[PDB]
Amino acid sequence: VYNDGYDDDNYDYIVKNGEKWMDRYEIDSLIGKGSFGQVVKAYDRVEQEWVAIKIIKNKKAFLNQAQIEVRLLELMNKHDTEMKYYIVHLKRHFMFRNHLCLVFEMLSYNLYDLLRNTNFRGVSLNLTRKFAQQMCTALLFLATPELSIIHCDLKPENILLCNPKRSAIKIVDFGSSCQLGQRIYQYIQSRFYRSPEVLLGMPYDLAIDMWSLGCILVEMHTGEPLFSGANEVDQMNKIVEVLGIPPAHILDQAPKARKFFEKLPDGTWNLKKTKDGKREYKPPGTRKLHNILGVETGGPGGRRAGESGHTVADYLKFKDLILRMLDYDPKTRIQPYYALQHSFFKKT
Ligand SMILES: Brc1cnc2[nH]nnc2c1
Ligand SMILES: Brc1cnc2[nH]nnc2c1
Ligand SMILES: [Cl-]
Ligand SMILES: [Cl-]
Ligand SMILES: [Cl-]
C-alpha cells in the first residue's frame, strides 16, 4: 500500500537483486544506506560499465534536498573536467518509480570500512598524510569563488577509496551541501564531526568542513572518533575537554551558548554547573591531543612504537596542523590553501 507496493514503510525503494530498469540498468545489490535513501550497485547495459545508483526516498523533503545535491554535483563536475579535485562524478540522473535516482561511477569502500579493516588500530601516519592532502586539495576546490560549496557532512563514511588497495579518494554525498549564503539548516553535520559554531547555533561558512576534516584525520590515525558525543551537550563537553572553554568573543555572540555555558559577572564563561556530586568530564583543556596522539610515546596507545614514518617530529607536525584545523575561531581556522603549505606535507 506504499507506492503501489514498490516502497517500504520508510519511503525507500524495495530493492530486488536482478531487477532490470528501463532496459538499461541491471540491479546487482544494495551497497549502502543512509538517511537519504539507498545506494545500489548496478550494471549499465548501454555504457557497458558498473555504476552506483543512489535511490532517493520517495518523499518530498528528500526529493527537494537531492535536487540541490544534483545542482551542486553538476556544478562541481563541470569545473573539474580533468576529475582531479577528488569529488565524485554524477554521470546522470532520472526519475524511476517516483524515486529520484543519481548515477555515479562505481567506487570502492569508504574510510570507515578501511578503519574497521585494521580493527580500529588506525592507519599509518603516511597514509593519513595522503588522505589529508587529497582532502585539503578538495576543500580548496570547493572554496573556489564560482563554487563556494560547503559539504556539511564530512565523515569517514563519505570519503571513498577509488580502489580498495590504493590511496586515491573521492568525496561523496553532497546531500546536505549548500553554497555560501544559501544556508538553510541549523542542525547539520554528523555529531562527532560537528563544529562549535554549528553547536552554538551561529552562522557558519566553509570553515565547518575544515573542522570536520581535523576530526576525521585524528580518527583515521588513532582508530576512534576524537569527540564522540552522545548528544549535543555531551559533544560540546568532549570538545571542551581537549580544547578548553571557547573564547568569550565567540560565546558572546553564540545564540546557544547558554545550552552549554554560563557567563560570570566578570564576563568570563564556564561550563554550566552540574548536579552536586556528579563528575563526568575531564577539566577544561586537560585531555591533551599531545597525549591522545602519543606524540612522545609511540603513537596512539603506543601502537606505533619503533615504526618508521612515525617520528616524534612527524607527530608534532601532525598535531600542529590538527590544532590549526580545530581553531575555535572560524575566521582564523586554517584554510585549505595554507593547510597545503604546512610542514606536515613537505618532503619525500
Ligand atoms: Br559513488 C557514491 C556512493 N555513495 C554515495 N552517497 N552519496 N553519494 C554517493 C556516491
Ligand atoms: Br588547545 C591544545 C590541545 N591539546 C594539545 N596537545 N598539545 N598541545 C595542545 C593544545
Ligand atoms: Cl545518512
Ligand atoms: Cl606506510
Ligand atoms: Cl572520551
Domain spans in the chain, listed from the N-terminal domain onward? 1-80+88-106, 81-87+107-347
What Å resolution does this PDB entry report? 2.3
Question: Taking Cα atoms as reference points, which of 124, 45, 118, 62 lies closest to residue 304?
Answer: 124
Q: Three cell numbers at 102?
A: 543519481
Count CA atoms within 13 Å of residue 47 on its CB side: 13
Residue 47 alpha carbon to ligand 1 centre in Å: 19
The burial of 328, by beta-carbon neighbours within 10 Å (0-12 exposed, 13-18 middle, 19 or more buried), is given as buried
Any ligand 2 atom below 6 A from CB of 15: no
* Alpha helices, H only, the chain: 60-78, 111-117, 125-142, 196-199, 207-222, 232-243, 248-251, 257-260, 289-292, 312-325, 336-339
Q: Probe ligand 1: pick from 39, 62, 158, max atoms within 8 Å of CB?
A: 39
Please tell me the distance from the alpha carbon of residue 216 to that of residue 111, in angstroms, as a whole number: 9
Q: Are 229 and 238 in contact (CB under 8 A)?
A: yes
Q: Which one, of 6, 45, 48, lies nearest residue 22 by Cα? A: 45
Is the Cβ atom of 173 under 6 angstroms away from ligand 1?
A: yes
Candidates 285, 280, 269; CA nearest to 233 is 280
The Cα 344–Cα 36 span in angstroms is 36
| Catalytic center residues | 153
Mark the binding-site residues for ATP, compressed into ranges.
Answer: 31-39, 54, 104-107
Q: Taking Cα atoms as reference points, which of 79, 91, 108 lies closest to residue 54?
A: 91
Closest listed residue to residue 148, CA positions, set 157, 139, 156? 139
CATH class given for the domain over 1-80+88-106: alpha beta
Three-state DSSP class for residue 28: strand
In angstroms, rounded to a whole number, what is the distance separating the alpha carbons of residues 237 and 49? 48
Distance CA 343, CA 26 (A): 48
What is residue 40's three-state secondary structure? strand
The reply to whether CATH 2.60.120.680 applies to domain 81-87+107-347 is no
- The coordinates were experimentally obtained by X-ray
- The vertex-158 CA angle with 136 and 173, nearest 5°, equals 100
User: Which distant-in-sequence residues (6+ apart) come within 8 Å of 345 by Cβ?
Assistant: 129, 132, 133
* Span from the CA of 171 to the centroid of ligand 3 (angstroms): 14
- Are 28 and 40 in contact, with CB atoms under 8 Å apart? yes
The C-alpha cell 545500489 sits at 40
